[PDB]
């Protein structure tokens, strides 16, 4: 759930002095019109609007600045610059009475992985594998990027994966739970949303790593393959039972890796259900393989995001003759930076195909 402990002119024009997301603080007057809510929650309100100068659509995430908790969302977003992470254009502050709200002006992205998957579900179809490949690959790229700065998202789930259906570009959003993890410094365990929470988090670990994002990603993958969440359940126990019912009871050593405080309890020994029986018979073997290397009890045994990008499941995306089903070409996929590849530079031989060099 939670983390650790303006003038109006004439359509109707709202003018504010907003600070650009990148570079040194150099605030500039920003004007926008056609404001409407495209989302509302206990966190605040999300609006769509159109910038007066360029006519470009933006999202404005308005969040209350609660001083009772640690708010790293702005601090974290400002440092991020990646093609698979939603762009922070500007931010500004505005006035619950006697309260100050933070406004994040972001690029507007019309869909999410969640809404798109819901379409296939109610249509009783499955998302074509080509999209599963495209979306998951871009997700892993975004994870490789944030992890290289030591930043863990902590809330990976389909609702936080924005999509432009025309370009098939995925952008990771919502850094309201994100944090730079430091070994030796404890974290909040009640993080990550139900269905997507790593087993070590459910066992209440406070010393977890960025590999919790990888588990969440594995859940997204499985969900896209399956047509529904793989580990549903209201409570942690409910969720862990679903996990055990697939992976089998974790061994004492796997338990120790997750949370040593549970090593001495005598858990009934449930047999693993073969991944090939979990999914439909027409599921590609390499998708199953990838999934099993993501959804591991031992956090250190999980693939890193960069390793996941290099997995054989994404081999098709490296074929020069591939295209989107709508006729268009695939988005940028091989423009890796030195930062992105820092965890494992030799992987560039796989990640950057020969036809991508030119």
């Amino acid at each position: 759930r939670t983390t650790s402990f303006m003038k109006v002119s004439r359509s109707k024009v709202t003018t504010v002095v907003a600070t650009p997301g990148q570079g040194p603080d150099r605030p500039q007057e920003v004007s926008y019109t056609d404001t409407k809510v495209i989302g509302n929650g206990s966190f605040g309100v999300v609006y769509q609007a159109k910038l007066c100068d360029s006519g470009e659509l933006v999202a404005i995430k308005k969040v209350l600045q609660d001083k009772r908790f640690k708010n790293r969302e702005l601090q974290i977003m400002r440092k991020l610059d990646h093609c698979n992470i939603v762009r922070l254009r500007y931010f500004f502050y505005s006035s619950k009475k006697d309260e100050v709200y933070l406004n994040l002006v972001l690029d507007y992205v019309p869909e999410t992985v969640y809404r798109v998957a819901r379409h296939y579900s109610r249509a009783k179809q499955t998302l074509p594998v080509i999209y599963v490949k495209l979306y998951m690959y871009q997700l892993f790229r975004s994870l490789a990027y944030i992890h290289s700065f030591g930043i863990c998202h902590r809330d990976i789930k389909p609702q936080n994966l924005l999509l432009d259906p025309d370009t098939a570009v995925l952008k990771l959003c919502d850094f309201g739970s994100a944090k730079q993890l430091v070994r030796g410094e404890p974290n909040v365990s009640y993080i990550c949303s139900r269905y997507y929470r790593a087993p070590e988090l459910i066992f209440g670990a406070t010393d977890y790593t960025s590999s919790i994002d990888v588990w969440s990603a594995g859940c997204v993958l499985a969900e896209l393959l399956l047509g529904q969440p793989i580990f549903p359940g209201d409570s942690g126990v409910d969720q862990l039972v679903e996990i055990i019912k697939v992976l089998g009871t974790p061994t004492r050593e796997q338990i120790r890796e997750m949370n040593p405080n549970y090593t001495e309890f005598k858990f009934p020994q449930i047999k693993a259900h073969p991944w090939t029986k979990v999914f439909r018979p027409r599921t590609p073997p390499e998708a199953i393989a990838l999934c099993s290397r993501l959804l591991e009890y031992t956090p250190t045994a999980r693939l890193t995001p960069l390793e996941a990008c290099a997995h054989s499941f994404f081999d098709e995306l490296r074929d020069p003759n591939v295209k989107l089903p709508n006729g268009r070409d695939t988005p940028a996929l091989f423009n890796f930076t030195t930062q992105e590849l820092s965890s494992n530079p030799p992987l560039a031989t796989i990640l950057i195909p020969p036809h991508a060099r030119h």
Partner: peptide, 19 residues
């Protein structure tokens, strides 16, 4: 939550899907 309390519930639940 208490590891003891969490484990008891989990053990109880795993016995039911096992039996």
């Amino acid at each position: 939550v208490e590891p003891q309390k969490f484990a008891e519930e989990l053990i109880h639940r795993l016995e039911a899907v096992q039996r």
